[PDB]
Write a protein that binds this ligand. Structure first.
Ligand code: CU
Ligand code: CU
Ligand code: CU
Ligand code: CU
Ligand code: CU
Ligand code: CU
Ligand code: CU
Ligand code: CU
Ligand code: CU
Ligand code: CU
Ligand code: CU
Lengths: 269, 269, 270
């Protein structure tokens, strides 16, 4: 594994929100995808452009307390302030006593832990979160990755009934990352596609007994992910994904997986 | 891979409820069990015998957009109308990219997507849902199958504290399909029995590390299944099943799995 | 497996309208005492209800007949001041004569009352009548220490909000947690700096176990799981939070610390 470096910035955005960006003026919600191989180290030069204390907390990856992103471990950042955070990762293997150490690989996420409360409640609602993917050697790589975040009642801090919509062509291998935040449980459902409830979202082969599902209950800070072959056995189309809690889907927690025919049309639009 | 047909009907029932049925005047809640082998195609000639728009959406199985049963896909049925829903399945197998294509096998369900709201909140509430089972070559087959739906605060739309109960004899292989609907998460618990948290609800052998459970958290549109040897290790008796959300069990989300001795008797109460 | 074991257990009132199980009169705790068995063991519990209300013992996961259900339905509760012997049994996994694999009993489980307040023990559970149960399979790795975290409604182990509990270890210790949930709410359990496999033992079997590896898990009333970590592994010593991740729940004090000490005893910096 490699040693990698990046810049990250925390910024306030024009409608009361907050975002992470790989450069000033280009903060997104969700924050930028961070992708690593088991074994890589990542040093993040972090800058808080905001006038409240901010920080960076990550799930799953190895980090010392000094990079925990919390007041407890004196790991937050002053308004306008600067901090270098270090995340490490490791491949799995047998310990000397026979036991198997798990591996860093998986779908994870990062978020603020100090805006509003000492658990980042205001930071998170306002949009200070994003995805982390860690790859194991030999993992299947996708053509695309879309991140879907159920934050309280909104997908990706979008107004009710505003997608996001996601585009692909028949036969593409599309990866989704699915993170939940806030107060509520939800239930993630995709029309016309299904996945394995295990680490990668795909069966290892014919001995993998994992449940095959198209609907999964998630809570605040759960993350998981999966890959599908777009259109596989179902064909082109506007395939809805949504929370399947009835009041939630009614109130617009819905969006589209736009699967285009080879030439580039969809039937019925 | 057999090609098969059934007829289905949506009809209003007593106390303003709605059910799918295999014949006019025999609609049930939950709907009739639909069972298929991986490879099978099912054509459902569906008649809406009601005064409102109605449809059929299935989870897990392969379907074209023209069969997603939603408004957007012009796939609902007009009052008194007729529509031909086609559900396909597939066996698992190797793709040319080296990857393992999952398979349709699973505990799944179907339900209205259009009554009440564009997400079928009204139809699901009234009882327009039933179970689907897609089996894999070699799967163990039950002596009976019983379907348990937590729909909001009701079980199978029964009044509080009124079942359903299910009867088996000791040593029966009994399969349960557990589906959840509506607004609320639940936790499904069975006294006296337990299952594996995986595709078939049974461990594939000693190297299957799946959690063995007797209680599982579910949310709206989650479906899972399992089989048990009735009263294995525990004996005959009235074995309660219920949601374990305390206010929920208190308010009525309780039923009985009545497990008789071979002479048909059951201890006590 | 397998031995016959016998204990005594008492249900008693505690201070602030609470109630608990204990191994001796006057020693009730919340959670109740950890019961640990090997697959194949039978345990006989000599249970005495010292309270003025009916109480029972009902267990998840293990083998019991209806006479040990702990319920009103099965005539299986205990009258005020009365005694009953409950029996729990366990079995190893095995091939059945129908060719299938019988699941074994081993795992992370719990017991609680089923009859205080309501016929579902809502008031008993509310007031502290619950405790952990662990069943081992031959060959299971044993830990240096076991800690029980119960999210009971909004409180952790019926402790007042923002009151821990905290658990201490040394870097390299093999530490077991048992995580149980009760009451009315869903929760999501999270631990900083550590992770586990979502499976029977919380540890992957080897390179081909595809179980999801997580540091966050949603749980509902009566769910129980467990896992073991090597404290500090890859992350070092530190004051490591665990908490519910439901934002309003963490904010309101559903939090505690896994205090992991260097081999020299220190936690930097503190
Ligand atoms: Cu966190
Ligand atoms: Cu935290
Ligand atoms: Cu939702
Ligand atoms: Cu977090
Ligand atoms: Cu749907
Ligand atoms: Cu839908
Ligand atoms: Cu419930
Ligand atoms: Cu659905
Ligand atoms: Cu019960
Ligand atoms: Cu909580
Ligand atoms: Cu219970």
């Amino acid at each position: 594994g490699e040693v990698r470096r990046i810049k990250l910035y925390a910024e306030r955005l024009a409608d009361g929100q907050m975002g992470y960006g790989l450069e000033k003026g280009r903060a997104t919600i969700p924050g930028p995808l961070i992708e690593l191989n088991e074994g890589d180290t990542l040093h993040i030069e972090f800058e808080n452009t905001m006038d409240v204390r901010a920080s960076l907390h990550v799930h799953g990856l190895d980090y010392e307390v000094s990079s925990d992103g919390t007041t407890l471990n004196k790991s937050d950042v002053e308004p306008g302030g600067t901090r270098t955070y270090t995340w490490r990762t490791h491949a799995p293997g047998r310990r000397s006593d026979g036991t198997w150490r798990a591996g860093s690989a998986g779908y994870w996420h990062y978020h603020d832990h100090v805006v509003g409360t000492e658990h980042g409640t205001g930071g998170i609602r306002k949009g200070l979160y994003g995805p982390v993917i860690v790859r194991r050697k030999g993992d299947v790589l996708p053509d695309a990755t879309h991140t879907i975040v159920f934050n309280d009642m909104l997908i990706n801090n979008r107004p009710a009934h505003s997608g996001p919509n996601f585009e692909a062509t028949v036969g593409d291998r599309v990866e989704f990352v699915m993170i939940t935040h806030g107060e509520y449980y939800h239930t993630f459902h995709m029309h016309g596609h299904r996945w394995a409830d295990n680490r990668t979202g795909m069966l290892t082969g014919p001995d993998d007994p994992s449940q095959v599902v198209d609907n999964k209950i998630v809570g605040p800070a759960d993350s998981f992910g999966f890959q599908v072959i777009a259109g596989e056995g179902v064909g082109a189309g506007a395939w809805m994904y949504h929370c399947h809690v009835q009041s939630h889907s009614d109130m617009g927690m819905v969006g589209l997986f736009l699967v285009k025919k080879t030439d580039g049309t969809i039937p019925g639009y």
